[PDB]
Tab-separated table of C-alpha atoms and ligand atoms in Angstrom:
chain	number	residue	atom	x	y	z
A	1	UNK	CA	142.899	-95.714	128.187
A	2	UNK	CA	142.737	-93.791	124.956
A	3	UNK	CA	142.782	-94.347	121.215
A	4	UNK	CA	146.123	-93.828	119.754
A	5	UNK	CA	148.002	-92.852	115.724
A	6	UNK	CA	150.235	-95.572	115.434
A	7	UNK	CA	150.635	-94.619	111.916
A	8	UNK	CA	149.096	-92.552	108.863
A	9	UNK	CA	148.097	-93.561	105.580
A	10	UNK	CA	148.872	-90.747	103.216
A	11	UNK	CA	146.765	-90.242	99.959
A	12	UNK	CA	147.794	-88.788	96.014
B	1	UNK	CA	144.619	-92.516	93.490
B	2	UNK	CA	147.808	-94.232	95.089
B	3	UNK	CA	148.400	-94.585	99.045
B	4	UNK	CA	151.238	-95.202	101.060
B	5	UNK	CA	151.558	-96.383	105.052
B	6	UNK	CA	153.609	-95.012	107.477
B	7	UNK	CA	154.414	-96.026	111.003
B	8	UNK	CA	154.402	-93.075	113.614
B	9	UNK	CA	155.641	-95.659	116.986
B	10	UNK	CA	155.750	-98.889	118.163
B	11	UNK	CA	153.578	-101.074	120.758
B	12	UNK	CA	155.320	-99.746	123.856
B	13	UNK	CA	155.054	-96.139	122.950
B	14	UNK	CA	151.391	-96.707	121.493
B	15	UNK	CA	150.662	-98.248	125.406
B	16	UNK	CA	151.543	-95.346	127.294
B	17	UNK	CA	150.090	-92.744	124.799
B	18	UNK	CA	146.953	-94.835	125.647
B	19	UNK	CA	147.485	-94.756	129.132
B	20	UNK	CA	148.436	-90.471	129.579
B	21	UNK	CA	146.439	-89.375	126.727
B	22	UNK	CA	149.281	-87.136	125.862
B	23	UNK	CA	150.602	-87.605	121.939
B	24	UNK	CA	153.402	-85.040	121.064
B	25	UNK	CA	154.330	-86.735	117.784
B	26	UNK	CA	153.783	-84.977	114.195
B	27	UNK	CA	150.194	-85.727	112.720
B	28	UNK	CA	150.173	-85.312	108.637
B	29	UNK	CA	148.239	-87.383	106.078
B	30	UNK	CA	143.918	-88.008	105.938
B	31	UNK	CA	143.869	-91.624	107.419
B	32	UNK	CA	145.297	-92.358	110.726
B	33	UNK	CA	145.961	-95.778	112.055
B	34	UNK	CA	144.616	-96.165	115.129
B	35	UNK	CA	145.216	-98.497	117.895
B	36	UNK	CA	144.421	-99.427	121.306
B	37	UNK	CA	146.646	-101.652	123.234
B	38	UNK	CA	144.590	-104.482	122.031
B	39	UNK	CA	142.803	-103.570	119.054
B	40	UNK	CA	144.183	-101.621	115.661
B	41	UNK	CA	141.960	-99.771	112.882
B	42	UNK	CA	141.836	-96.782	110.655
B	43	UNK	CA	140.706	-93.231	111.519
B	44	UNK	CA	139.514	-90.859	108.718
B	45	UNK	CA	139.622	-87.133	108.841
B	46	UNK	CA	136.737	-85.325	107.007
B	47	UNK	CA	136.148	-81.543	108.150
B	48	UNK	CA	138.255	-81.254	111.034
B	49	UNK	CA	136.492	-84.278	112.555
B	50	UNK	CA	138.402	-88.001	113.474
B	51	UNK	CA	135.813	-90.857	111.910
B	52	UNK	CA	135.864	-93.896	113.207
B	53	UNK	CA	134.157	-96.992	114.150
B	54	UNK	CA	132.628	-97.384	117.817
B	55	UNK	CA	133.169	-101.460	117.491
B	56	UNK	CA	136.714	-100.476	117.760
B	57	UNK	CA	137.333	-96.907	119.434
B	58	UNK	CA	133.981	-97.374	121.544
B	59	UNK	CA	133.468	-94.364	123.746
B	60	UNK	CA	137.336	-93.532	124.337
B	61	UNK	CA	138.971	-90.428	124.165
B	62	UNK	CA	141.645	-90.246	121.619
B	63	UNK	CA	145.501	-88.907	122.214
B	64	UNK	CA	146.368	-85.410	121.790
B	65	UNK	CA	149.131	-82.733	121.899
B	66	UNK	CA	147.022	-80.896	125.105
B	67	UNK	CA	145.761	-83.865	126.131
B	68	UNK	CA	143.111	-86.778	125.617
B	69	UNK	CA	140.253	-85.399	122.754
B	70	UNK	CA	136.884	-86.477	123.821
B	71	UNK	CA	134.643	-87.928	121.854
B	72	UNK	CA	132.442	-84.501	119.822
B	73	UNK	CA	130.292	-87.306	118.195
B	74	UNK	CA	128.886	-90.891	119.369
B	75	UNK	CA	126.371	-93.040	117.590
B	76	UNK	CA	126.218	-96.731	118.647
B	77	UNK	CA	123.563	-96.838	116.457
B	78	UNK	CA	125.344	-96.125	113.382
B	79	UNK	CA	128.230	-97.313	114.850
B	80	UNK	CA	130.412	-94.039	114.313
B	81	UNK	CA	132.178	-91.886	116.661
B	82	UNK	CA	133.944	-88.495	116.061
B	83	UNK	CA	136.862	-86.114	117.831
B	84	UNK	CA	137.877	-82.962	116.738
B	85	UNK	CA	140.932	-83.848	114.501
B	86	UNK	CA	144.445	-82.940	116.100
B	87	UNK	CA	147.081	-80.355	114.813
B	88	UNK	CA	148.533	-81.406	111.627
B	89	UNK	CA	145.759	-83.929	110.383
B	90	UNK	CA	144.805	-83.046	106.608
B	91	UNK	CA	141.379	-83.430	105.479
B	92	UNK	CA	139.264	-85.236	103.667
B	93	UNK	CA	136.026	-83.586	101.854
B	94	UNK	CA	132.568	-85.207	101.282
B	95	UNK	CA	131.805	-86.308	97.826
B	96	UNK	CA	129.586	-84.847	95.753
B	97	UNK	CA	130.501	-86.569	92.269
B	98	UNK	CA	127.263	-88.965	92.581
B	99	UNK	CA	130.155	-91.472	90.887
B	100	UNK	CA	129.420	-95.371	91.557
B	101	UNK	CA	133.512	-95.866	91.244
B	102	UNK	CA	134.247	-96.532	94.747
B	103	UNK	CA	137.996	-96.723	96.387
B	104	UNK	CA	137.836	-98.113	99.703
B	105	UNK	CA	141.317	-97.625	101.631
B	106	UNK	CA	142.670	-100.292	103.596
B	107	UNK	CA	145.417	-100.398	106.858
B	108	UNK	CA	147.833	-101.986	104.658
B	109	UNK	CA	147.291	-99.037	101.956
B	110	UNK	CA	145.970	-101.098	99.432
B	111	UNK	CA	143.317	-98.756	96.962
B	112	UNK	CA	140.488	-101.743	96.333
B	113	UNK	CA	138.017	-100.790	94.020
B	114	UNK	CA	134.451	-101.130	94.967
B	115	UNK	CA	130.731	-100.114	93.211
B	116	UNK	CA	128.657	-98.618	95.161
B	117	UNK	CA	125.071	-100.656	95.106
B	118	UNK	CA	123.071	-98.681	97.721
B	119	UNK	CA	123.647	-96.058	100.202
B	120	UNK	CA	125.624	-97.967	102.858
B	121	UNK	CA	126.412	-100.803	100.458
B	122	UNK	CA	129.453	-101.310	97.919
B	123	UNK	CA	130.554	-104.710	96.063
B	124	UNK	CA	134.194	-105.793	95.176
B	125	UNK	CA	135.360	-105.539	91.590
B	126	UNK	CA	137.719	-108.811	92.804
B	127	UNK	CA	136.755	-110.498	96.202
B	128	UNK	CA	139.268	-110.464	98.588
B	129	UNK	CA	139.383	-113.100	102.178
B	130	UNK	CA	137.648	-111.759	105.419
B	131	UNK	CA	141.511	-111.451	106.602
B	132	UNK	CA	142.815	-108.587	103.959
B	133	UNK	CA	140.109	-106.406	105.621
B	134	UNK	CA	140.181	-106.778	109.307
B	135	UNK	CA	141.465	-103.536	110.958
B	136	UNK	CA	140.821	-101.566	108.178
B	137	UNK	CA	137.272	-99.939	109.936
B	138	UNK	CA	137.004	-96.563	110.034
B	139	UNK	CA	139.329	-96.744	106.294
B	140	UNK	CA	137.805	-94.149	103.744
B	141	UNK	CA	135.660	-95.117	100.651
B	142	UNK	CA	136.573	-92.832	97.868
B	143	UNK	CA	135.530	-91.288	94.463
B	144	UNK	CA	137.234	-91.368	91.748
B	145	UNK	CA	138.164	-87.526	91.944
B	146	UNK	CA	139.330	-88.396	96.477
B	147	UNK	CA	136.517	-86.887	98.283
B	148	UNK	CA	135.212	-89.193	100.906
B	149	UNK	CA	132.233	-91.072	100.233
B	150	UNK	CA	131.525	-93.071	103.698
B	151	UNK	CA	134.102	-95.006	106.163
B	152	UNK	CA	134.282	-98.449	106.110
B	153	UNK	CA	132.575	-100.331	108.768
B	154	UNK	CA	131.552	-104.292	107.930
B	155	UNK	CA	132.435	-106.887	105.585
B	156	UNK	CA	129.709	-108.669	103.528
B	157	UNK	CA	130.836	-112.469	103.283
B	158	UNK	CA	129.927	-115.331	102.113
B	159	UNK	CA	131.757	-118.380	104.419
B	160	UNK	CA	135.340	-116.189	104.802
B	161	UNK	CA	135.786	-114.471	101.396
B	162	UNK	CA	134.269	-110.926	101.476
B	163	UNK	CA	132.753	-110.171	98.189
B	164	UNK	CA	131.399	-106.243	99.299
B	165	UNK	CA	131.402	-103.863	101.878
B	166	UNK	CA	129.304	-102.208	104.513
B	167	UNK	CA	130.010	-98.506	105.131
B	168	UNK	CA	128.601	-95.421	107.153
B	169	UNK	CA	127.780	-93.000	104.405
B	170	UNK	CA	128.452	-89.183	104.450
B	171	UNK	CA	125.492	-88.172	104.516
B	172	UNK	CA	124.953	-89.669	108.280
B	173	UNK	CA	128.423	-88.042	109.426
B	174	UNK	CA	126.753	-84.555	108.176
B	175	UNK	CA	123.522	-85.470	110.033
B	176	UNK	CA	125.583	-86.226	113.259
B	177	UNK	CA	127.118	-82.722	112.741
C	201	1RR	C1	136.978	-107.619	107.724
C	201	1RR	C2	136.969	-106.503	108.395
C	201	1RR	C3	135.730	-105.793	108.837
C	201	1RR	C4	135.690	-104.303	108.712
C	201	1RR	C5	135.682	-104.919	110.083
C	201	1RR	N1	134.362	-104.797	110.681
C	201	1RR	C6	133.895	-105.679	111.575
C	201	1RR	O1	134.540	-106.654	111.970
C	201	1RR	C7	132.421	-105.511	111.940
C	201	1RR	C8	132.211	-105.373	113.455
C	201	1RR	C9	130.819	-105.963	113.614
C	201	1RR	O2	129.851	-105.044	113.018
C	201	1RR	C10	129.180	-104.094	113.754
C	201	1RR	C11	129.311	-103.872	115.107
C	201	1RR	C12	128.596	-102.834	115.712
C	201	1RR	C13	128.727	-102.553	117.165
C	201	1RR	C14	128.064	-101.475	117.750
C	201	1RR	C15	128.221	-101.193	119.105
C	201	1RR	C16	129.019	-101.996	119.896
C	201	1RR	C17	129.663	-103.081	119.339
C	201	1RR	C18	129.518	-103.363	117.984
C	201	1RR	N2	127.745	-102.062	115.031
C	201	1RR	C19	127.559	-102.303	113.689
C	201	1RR	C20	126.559	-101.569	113.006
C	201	1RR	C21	126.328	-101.833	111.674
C	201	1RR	O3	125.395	-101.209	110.882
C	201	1RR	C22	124.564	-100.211	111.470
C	201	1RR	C23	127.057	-102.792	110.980
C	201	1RR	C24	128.022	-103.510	111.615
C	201	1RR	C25	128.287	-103.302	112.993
C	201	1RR	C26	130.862	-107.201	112.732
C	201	1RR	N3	131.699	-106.753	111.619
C	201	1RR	C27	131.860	-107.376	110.435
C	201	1RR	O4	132.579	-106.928	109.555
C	201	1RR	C28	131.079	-108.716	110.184
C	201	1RR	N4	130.216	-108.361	109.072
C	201	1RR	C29	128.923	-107.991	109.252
C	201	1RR	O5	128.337	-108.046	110.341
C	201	1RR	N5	128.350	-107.640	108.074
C	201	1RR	C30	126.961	-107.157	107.872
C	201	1RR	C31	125.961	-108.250	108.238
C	201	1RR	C32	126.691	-105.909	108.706
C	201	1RR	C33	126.839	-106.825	106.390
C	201	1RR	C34	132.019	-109.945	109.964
C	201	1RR	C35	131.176	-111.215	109.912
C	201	1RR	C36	132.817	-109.835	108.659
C	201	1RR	C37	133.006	-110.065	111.124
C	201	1RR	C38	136.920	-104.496	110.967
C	201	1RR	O6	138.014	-104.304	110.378
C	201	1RR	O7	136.721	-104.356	112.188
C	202	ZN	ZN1	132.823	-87.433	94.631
């Protein structure tokens, strides 16, 4: 299988 | 320096992304949770390249609009791995402040504050349990000014409570390039 984005993390 | 989560899918959708390799959905933001049908961590972006841990992402490929993205850079050693970021990841530059005023980034987007007391090395302005930290490897340590300074990779404890952190610095993920 692969690594997947499950989600982000957004920075100010 | 504030941070905010966002989820992108669920389980289901996160197993068969793992399984075709194939990920059509909208990449934004410098930090990218990353899971595995098992396993979840963090995956930061610095110059168009993916960081992340190889305890977690080991030598796997990593879901993409044309397909899986193999691996550009693997160092078991260091334990650090690379891909060539996908469309719409923002990016993250090294730091070159110097500054000892650490921000290490966590899954949960918490913005800890850490010193940095070596090159790979960091303590915790307030300790925090071995438990607020797991799955946030591969999470960005920051300067005060948001340029990355390593990516977080251990947890220094002392019987369960964490009281610094381990990181691969910068410098290595230049070296590697
Ligand atoms: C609390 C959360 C912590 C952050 C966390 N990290 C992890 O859980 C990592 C994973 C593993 O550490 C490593 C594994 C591998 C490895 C390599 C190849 C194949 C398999 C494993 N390579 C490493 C190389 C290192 O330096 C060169 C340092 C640590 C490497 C152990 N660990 C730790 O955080 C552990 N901490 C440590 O081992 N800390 C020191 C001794 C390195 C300072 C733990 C006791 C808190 C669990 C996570 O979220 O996964
Ligand atoms: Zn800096």
């Amino acid at each position: 299988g692969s690594v997947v984005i499950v989600g982000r993390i957004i920075l100010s | 320096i504030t941070a905010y989560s966002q989820q992108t899918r669920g389980l289901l959708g996160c197993i068969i992304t793992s399984l075709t390799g194939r990920d059509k959905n909208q990449v934004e933001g410098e930090v990218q949770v990353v899971s595995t049908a098992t396993q979840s961590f963090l995956a930061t972006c610095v110059n168009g390249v993916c960081w992340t841990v190889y305890h977690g992402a080991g030598s796997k490929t990593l879901a993409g609009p044309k397909g899986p993205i193999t691996q550009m850079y693997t160092n078991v050693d260091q334990d650090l791995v690379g891909w060539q970021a996908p469309p719409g990841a923002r990016s993250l530059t090294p730091c070159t402040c110097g500054s000892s005023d650490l921000y290490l980034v966590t899954r949960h987007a918490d913005v800890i504050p850490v010193r940095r007391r070596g090159d790979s090395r960091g303590s915790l302005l307030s300790p925090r349990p071995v438990s607020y930290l797991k799955g946030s490897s591969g999470g960005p340590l920051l300067c005060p000014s948001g340029h990355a300074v390593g990516i977080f990779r251990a947890a220094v404890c002392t019987r369960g409570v964490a009281k610094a952190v381990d990181f691969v610095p910068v410098e290595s993920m230049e070296t590697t390039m």
